[PDB]
UniProtKB/Swiss-Prot annotation, chains A, B:
Record's subunit section: Homodimer; non-covalently linked (probable alternative/compact dimer conformation).
Family: Belongs to the phospholipase A2 family. Group II subfamily. K49 sub-subfamily.
Assigned GO CC terms: extracellular region
Organism: Bothrops moojeni (Lance-headed viper)
Sites marked Hydrophobic membrane-disruption site (MDiS): L112, F115
One of the record's GO molecular function terms: phospholipid binding
Domain of life: Eukaryota
Protein name as catalogued: Basic phospholipase A2 homolog myotoxin II
Site (Cationic membrane-docking site (MDoS)): K15, K19, K113, K118
Length: 122, 122
C-alpha cells in the first residue's frame, strides 16, 4: 500500500516522501504517466508500469510484509501479487535514492501533470 | 475538454487555472475525490461528480461548443453528452469565482491528495 511505499522511500532517500515525490514531474505520485522529465521521473514511470501489470491485488490499498536484513529490503513471501507489489516498491525506493544527485526542486509540484506529453506504452 | 475548462476558469476567476487549482485541496485538479477542505474544494467535488455521470463522451479530451452573450457562458448543444459536459465546466468556473474570498493558498499544492478521507458516493 502507499504506507509501505512511503516508509521505504523515507528510509532509502532520507526525504519527506509525499512532499518530495507526491506531485513530482510527469510520473511521480498522484495521477498517471507521461513523458519523463529526468532520471527521478523515469524511476516513477517504471514504477507505474510495474503497478499496471498487477491485476490480482490493489497496489494503493493492500498491505504486505517486508523486513530489513542489514541494509537490504527483503520482500516476504506473501502471495504472488503482493510479493510482486513489494518488489515494485523496493525497486523505486532504491532508484530514487541513486538519483538524488539530479533531483530538481523546480519539478516537485507539477501542476501541469494533466498536460504532460503522451508516454510510451508500458 | 480541459482546454475549454481552463479558458472558462481564467476568464471567471482572473487566476492562472492550473497553478491555482491544478492540485488544490482533496478534489481540485489532478487525481480523484476526497473529503472537501473548504468551499473552493466543494466546487471541485461537485464538478468531479458531474463528470462521473456523463456517458458517451470523454470529459478531458472532447471539445464542445460555447460562446459568450455579454457576461453569460452559453453552451451550444453539440450532442446531449457534450451539452452536459459544457454545463459541468460552466458551473465550476462560476463556483470558483464566487468563492475567491475564501481561497487559501496553503491548500494549493496538496501533495497529500492520495491520503484524503474517502469521498461519499456522488
Ligand atoms: C502521489 C502519491 O503519493 O501516490 C502514488 C504513488 C505511487 C503510485 C500511485 C500513486 C497514486 O496516488 O496514484
Ligand atoms: C487535474 C487538472 O488540472 O485536471 C482535471 C480537472 C478537472 C477534472 C479532472 C482533471 C484530471 O486531471 O483528472
Amino acid at each position: 500500500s502507499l504506507f509501505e511505499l512511503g516508509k521505504m522511500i523515507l528510509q532509502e532517500t532520507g526525504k519527506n516522501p509525499a512532499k518530495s515525490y507526491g506531485v513530482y514531474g510527469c510520473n511521480c505520485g498522484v495521477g498517471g504517466r507521461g513523458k519523463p522529465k529526468d532520471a527521478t521521473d523515469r524511476c516513477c514511470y517504471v514504477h507505474k508500469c510495474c503497478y499496471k501489470k498487477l491485476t490480482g491485488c490493489d497496489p494503493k490499498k493492500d498491505r504486505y510484509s517486508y523486513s530489513w536484513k542489514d541494509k537490504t529490503i527483503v520482500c516476504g513471501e506473501n502471495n504472488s501479487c503482493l510479493k510482486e507489489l513489494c518488489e515494485c516498491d523496493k525497486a523505486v525506493a532504491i532508484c530514487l535514492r541513486e538519483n538524488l544527485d539530479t533531483y530538481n526542486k523546480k519539478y516537485r509540484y507539477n501542476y501541469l501533470k494533466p498536460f504532460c506529453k503522451k508516454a510510451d506504452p508500458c
